[PDB]
């Protein structure tokens, strides 16, 4: 019954994919940011001046205060507010209604985006990293034990406005070409993988595999870019540099600030190399490869002048928490999160991005040996 999933996600290009839910009795209908990256259901309770609309848990006989306050800090932005539950249910999702934990934001500071047209966002990631701590219930978690949904859903995120789909329970077959390829959920927290090697148009960038895992790596739905750490972002950028030489570009744009233009249809594709990250296997020495392209991680934005040229960002940036794989590096590919088998799963998307004469590939098997090494501790 998973083509009644299908294309329910929407969204604005840098600004996150989200699906439609209702809270409370009688159902009311608000637009949820879809995030891996926590594990929080939080949702706008309170007037803003970018929100639509908002919770108003007044008009819901099912809401029960939790009389505790809560917040969350994020890279970007934050919010806080009070917890409470009542019932929830996804239109264009399983057929079930679940009690979940709803925290209600009162107050927040770069958070809700200006017309962005979500009022609030789902952390699908586990209760470790839960606030303000792991007693708070994630509605996954929540879905899986009061219903009979299996324990794993998989996410179509379609690039540039834009589309996708969340498959809640399941693997959506029509949805991904080719094989899927498994990598072992490192621990329970954040969506952890273990990263093994890294190659930058097939030269291998020859670092100690810890730097590509320092200190952790995350699949990360909940932010635009590729980020990497220090050392990694520095080797990257030098590489990708040298590979498109033939121009110039101002340094700001290596930065993520200024934006790069071309006479439209002329954007010179093919200097920018692809990058193959190769993830952990499922058994002894094994590993397999995912490669992206240069249209995932030149993000196309919205010329601020009047000529209509083809105009991008940099989307690769610089962290100092680790590797973040966000939504640049899963658009193009079917990614499942199988919490019942630890597990995340990629395979080549239906929505692929299209080169001429290059192809975004999941690619396996590889031998690596040591690859317990490369997690850091
Ligand atoms: C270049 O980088 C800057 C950057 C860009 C972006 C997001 C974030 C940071 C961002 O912060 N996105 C966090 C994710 O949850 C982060 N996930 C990992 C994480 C990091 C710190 C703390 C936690 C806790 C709460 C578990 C979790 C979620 C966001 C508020 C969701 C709202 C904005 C969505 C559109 C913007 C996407 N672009």
Redesign the pocket.
């Known amino acids: 019954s998973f083509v009644e999933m299908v294309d329910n996600l929407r969204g604005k290009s840098?600004?996150?994919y989200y699906v439609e839910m209702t809270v409370g009795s009688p159902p009311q209908t608000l637009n949820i940011?879809v995030?891996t990256?926590?594990?929080?259901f939080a949702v706008g309770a309170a007037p803003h001046p970018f929100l639509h609309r908002y919770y108003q848990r007044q008009l819901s006989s099912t809401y029960r205060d939790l009389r505790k306050g809560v917040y969350?800090?994020?890279?970007?932005?934050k919010w806080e507010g009070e917890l409470g539950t009542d019932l929830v249910s996804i239109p264009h999702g399983p057929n079930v209604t679940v009690r979940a934990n709803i925290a209600a934001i009162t107050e927040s500071d770069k958070?809700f985006?200006n017309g962005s047209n979500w009022e609030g966002?789902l952390?699908l990631?586990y209760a470790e990293?839960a606030?303000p701590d792991d007693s708070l219930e994630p509605f996954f978690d929540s879905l899986v034990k009061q219903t009979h949904v299996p324990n794993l859903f998989s996410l179509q995120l379609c690039g540039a406005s834009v589309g996708g789909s969340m498959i809640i329970g399941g693997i959506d077959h029509s949805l991904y070409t080719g094989s899927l390829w498994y990598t072992p959920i490192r621990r329970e927290w954040?969506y952890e993988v273990i990263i093994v090697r890294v190659e930058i148009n097939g030269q291998d960038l020859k670092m100690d595999c810890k730097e590509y895992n320092y200190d952790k790596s995350?699949v990360?739905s909940?932010?635009?870019?590729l980020?990497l750490p220090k050392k990694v972002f520095e080797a990257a950028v030098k590489s990708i540099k040298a590979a498109s030489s033939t121009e110039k570009f101002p340094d700001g744009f290596w930065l993520?600030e200024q934006l790069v233009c071309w006479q439209a249809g002329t954007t010179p594709w093919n200097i920018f190399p692809v990058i193959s990250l190769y993830l952990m296997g499922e058994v002894t020495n094994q590993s397999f490869r995912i490669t992206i392209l240069p249209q995932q991680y030149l993000r196309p934005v919205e010329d601020v002048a009047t000529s209509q040229d083809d105009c991008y960002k940099f989307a690769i940036?610089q962290s100092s928490?680790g590797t973040?794989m966000?939504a640049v590096i899963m658009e193009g590919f079917y990614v499942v999160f199988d919490r019942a088998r630890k597990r995340i799963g990629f395979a080549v998307s239906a929505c692929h991005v299209h080169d001429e004469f290059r192809t975004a590939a999941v690619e396996g098997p590889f031998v690596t040996l040591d690859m317990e090494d490369c997690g850091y501790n």
């Open positions: 840098g600004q996150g940011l995030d990256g926590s594990s929080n969350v800090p994020y890279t970007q932005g958070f985006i966002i952390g990631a990293i606030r954040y995350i990360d909940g932010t635009t870019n980020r993520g940036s928490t973040v966000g």
